[PDB]
Structure formats: structure tokens, C-alpha cells
Design a binder for this molecule. Structure first.
Ligand code: GLF
Ligand code: ZN
Length: 472
């Protein structure tokens, strides 16, 4: 049967199912309703930066149509909705003056979700730093971001926290550090060679450190000022794609483990254990900032749950560890990516070149976190796959590959959970086709089709699959 034995009965009692979006990717009204620009508005408006010179000015226009989209997620039997608040829609300059119209939007969205029986899971940050803070402070290179982010978080806790009980601070700080400061392909476009300046060997580590310190400061503020009255929780969202040793050799197994540590351990070891992974300390040395004992104690235990975005898996091949002139965070790992074993690809690719369809990667990742980090509460905060541009409407709706994707990946998640992993929830990226960063509207991740000419929504087969699987 097309559900492949899956239903709410196949998951733990009270397991949470939802869908996910982010502000810049779906809201639209980017320069309206009092919203100030983010670094992504500046980046997307520069010719050549995004596919087709597209931008999030209108996106899916969820700003005007949010009740339609909430009605739709309820009709599909979801329990929860993960979305983000745009910092520059609340504080156009990132600090100081509050945009009351922006505040009213999120109030209206939250209230409607609750009216419809959908639990809000709210991200404070999803790549969309206020442009004013980039220009004035240098963004995530500046330790002052801890204070700036904390004041923003404080306002959100105060304003929405009587209703919102499930918060996340950041979304994938690894990707910010990697793409923004190592490779220089996302804003602020920094890297050793880049026109904007930068240093691919040092800046990604500075940035990650400041994300961890800011997360910790925001959570300390929540716990000391708001938690007694509000009784909610705050976590963080981290990306984790799986790494599998190419062979059982000592060096291939070491390589796969090094990749895990540089990928997820970079954040989880501080959040769980209060230090950076030993291998990163050993290889990155004085380029890796040191937490003071007080800072490490603030960071350790500061996530009430760990959000994991899980998409794909790679084979890793090793080498003898070498003394090397530092060049980049990426080269620091001393690993070799490989996409076939025994003459077979690890999986077929979705539309995005990086996205290999490997359902057992989901089991790999969840099992690994369970075994290595004392089985913390995990929420799968995003998982999904994309269709290419230029299909007909009907071709978009017949998304049989995405149906197979979710059935297979959710079967592997169920496998990890049945073996004892503490997973509390699962969220599909995305509710809607949306603005896919550098790919613009050329990549379609939604279980709901969005016609970007007319803005109409049409559920795809994968939406109906969820509705059938999730019926109460
Ligand atoms: O690449 C698909 C999707 O991956 C992650 F979930 C990011 O948080 C999203 O912003 C992105 O659109
Ligand atoms: Zn509109």
C-alpha cells in the first residue's frame, strides 16, 4: 500500500508532524509593511547573484495569504508549523525602533495557527540578518552579535511567548559559516579570494563561535526572565548530512568520523559537552576560538532540543593526516568525497546537485546522535527534495519521486526511533514551493505546488500522501 505501513500508530504517542518554511523564502512583502532590508535583499537584488536575477520581493506572498496556507496545512492533518520571524520586519535596523505593523503580522499568524489547532514552532533567525547590522557591526564576525541577538530574542519572548512555547534561535549556522565566509557564495560573500574581503581559514570559525555564544546568551535570557511564567522551550536547528566510510579501512573510517565532527560535532559538542570536538582542536589549533570556562558552561546544556535538518549522505575516503598550511574550513577536514561504492552511486540526485536520495542517511544520522551524545531530544526540523524548473502544473502535482522519498526516509526514521532514539517530531521541508536561495524559483521543494505567475496553491500527490498517513 502507498503508505508502506506508515501512520500515526507507527510513531510514538504525541509525536509531532509538521511542515516548515522560512520568512524570506515565503513571506514576500520584503520592502513593505515597514520591513527593513536583510543581507539577502541586498544580495538577491544584485544582478547575477540568483538564478534569473530572482528575489524574495513577492515569493509565495504568504504575508497576505497566510490563512489560506494555515487552512491547507490543517486539511493535510499536520499538528505543527515551523516558520521564522524576520528580524528586520520587527526591527527594520536590527535594533532600536519596533515596526508595529511587522509585530501585528506575526501576532495574526500565531493566533490563527492556534485558532486552527496548529502548534507554532518559531525560528528567530533564518539567514536573514538585518542589512543595518551587517553594515554597522560586521554581522557575525562581531562578538557584539550576542547582545544584539539577545535584545531581539528578548523582545520576541516578551511579545509572543505567552502563546509560543517552542522556539529555535538559529537555522544551520554551519551553512552560514561555510557559504558566507568559507566559499563566499552566500552573503556576505566573504572568502580569501573574494571582492568583499575575508579569510576562509579563520572567519568560518569566528562566525560559528559567535552563533554559539549568541544562542547561549539568548537562552540564558529566556531561562532567567521568561521561562517561569511562559514555560516554553528553546532549541537550535543544525544541518547534518550523513558520512559513510568508503571502506572498513582505518583511514576511511577515521575520515568519515572526521567529517561528522567537522559537520555536526562543531556545534553539538559545545551544546552537549561544553567543548569543541577534539579533532577540531587538534587540526584547527589557534584558528579555533576557545571558550572560557564560564562561556562553555553557558553554552553546555543550552538547547532544550536539537533540531536536525537531514537531507543526504556521502561516502568519505581517508588519507594520512598531513601538516598543511591552513587554507579553509573545508580543507581542514582532510577528507575526500566519493559518490560511488562498488561501482554504484550512493543514490540518484533530486534537482539540487548536492541532494542525493539516500534514505539510510536518515537512520545513520539519528542513530549516531543517539549513540554519541547521550540520546538528546531531537526534532527532525527539515527533510525533503526538489523538482526542477519548467515542468507543467500536472507534472509538478504528480510528484511520485517525492512520495517515495518521504515513505523511504520516514521508514528509516521509524527504524531509528524503534531502536530507542529520542526523536520528538518531524517537519517536511517545505509546505510550499518557494524561493530556494541561489536557485531562486528554479528549485521546487514543496508538498504544495505554487504557480509563481498567479500565486495559486495546489496540493501535490505528496501532500495527499501526508494527509492519508497523518489522519487522526
Ligand atoms: O535546501 C532546502 C532547504 O534546506 C534547509 F532546510 C534550509 O533551512 C532551507 O532554507 C532550504 O531551502
Ligand atoms: Zn499580496
Amino acid at each position: 500500500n502507498w503508505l508502506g505501513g506508515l501512520s500515526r500508530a507507527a510513531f510514538p504517542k504525541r509525536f509531532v508532524f509538521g511542515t516548515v518554511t522560512s520568512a524570506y523564502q515565503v513571506e514576500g512583502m520584503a520592502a513593505s509593511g515597514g520591513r527593513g532590508p536583510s543581507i539577502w535583499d541586498a544580495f538577491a537584488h544584485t544582478p547575477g547573484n540568483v538564478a534569473g536575477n530572482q528575489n524574495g520581493d513577492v515569493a509565495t506572498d504568504q504575508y497576505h495569504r497566510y490563512k489560506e496556507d494555515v487552512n491547507l496545512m490543517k486539511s493535510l492533518n499536520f499538528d505543527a508549523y515551523r516558520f521564522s520571524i524576520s528580524w528586520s520586519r520587527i526591527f527594520p535596523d536590527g535594533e532600536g525602533r519596533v515596526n508595529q505593523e511587522g509585530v501585528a503580522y506575526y501576532n495574526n499568524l500565531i493566533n490563527y495557527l492556534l485558532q486552527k489547532g496548529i502548534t507554532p514552532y518559531v525560528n528567530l533567525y533564518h539567514y536573514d540578518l538585518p542589512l543595518a547590522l551587517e553594515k554597522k557591526y560586521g554581522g557575525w564576525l562581531n562578538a557584539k552579535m550576542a547582545d544584539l541577538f539577545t535584545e531581539y530574542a528578548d523582545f520576541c519572548f516578551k511579545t509572543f511567548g505567552n502563546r509560543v512555547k517552542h522556539w529555535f534561535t538559529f537555522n544551520e549556522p554551519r551553512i552560514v559559516a561555510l557559504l558566507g565566509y568559507d566559499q563566499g557564495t552566500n552573503p556576505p560573500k566573504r572568502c580569501t579570494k573574494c571582492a568583499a574581503g575575508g579569510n576562509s581559514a579563520t572567519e568560518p570559525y569566528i562566525v560559528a563561535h559567535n552563533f554559539l555564544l549568541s544562542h547561549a546568551a539568548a537562552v540564558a535570557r529566556y531561562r532567567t526572565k521568561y521561562q517561569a511564567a511562559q514555560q516554553g522551550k528553546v532549541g537550535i536547528v543544525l544541518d547534518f548530512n550523513w558520512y559513510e566510510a568508503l571502506s572498513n579501512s582505518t583511514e576511511d573510517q577515521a575520515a568519515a568520523q572526521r567529517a561528522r565532527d567537522f559537520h555536526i560535532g562543531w556545534y553539538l559538542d559545545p551544546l552537549i559537552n561544553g567543548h569543541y570536538p577534539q579533532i577540531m582542536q587538534d587540526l584547527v589549533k589557534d584558528r579555533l576560538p576557545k571558550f572560557t570556562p564560564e562561556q562553555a558552561r553557558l553554552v553546555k546544556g543550552s538547547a532544550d532540543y536539537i533540531g536536525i535538518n537531514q537531507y543526504t549522505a556521502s561516502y568519505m575516503k581517508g588519507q594520512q593526516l598531513m601538516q598543511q598550511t591552513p587554507t579553509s574550513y573545508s580543507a581542514d577536514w582532510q577528507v575526500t568525497y566519493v559518490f560511488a561504492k562498488n561501482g554504484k552511486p550512493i543514490g540518484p540526485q533530486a534537482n539540487s546537485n548536492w541532494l542525493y536520495i539516500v534514505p539510510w542517511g536518515m537512520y545513520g544520522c539519528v542513530n549516531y546522535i543517539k549513540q554519541k551524545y547521550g540520546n538528546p531530544t531531537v526534532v527532525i526540523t527539515g527533510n525533503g527534495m526538489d523538482q526542477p524548473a519548467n515542468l507543467s502544473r500536472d507534472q509538478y502535482l504528480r510528484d511520485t519521486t517525492r512520495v517515495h522519498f518521504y515513505r523511504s526516509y520516514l521508514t528509516q526514521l521509524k527504524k531509528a526511533i524503534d531502536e530507542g532514539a529520542n526523536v520528538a517530531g518531524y517537519f517536511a521541508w517545505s509546505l510550499l514551493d518557494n524561493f530556494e536561495w541561489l536557485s531562486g524559483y528554479t528549485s521546487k521543494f514543496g508538498i504544495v505546488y505554487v504557480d509563481f505567475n498567479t500565486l495559486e496553491r495546489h496540493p501535490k500527490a505528496s501532500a495527499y500522501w501526508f494527509r492519508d498517513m497523518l489522519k487522526h
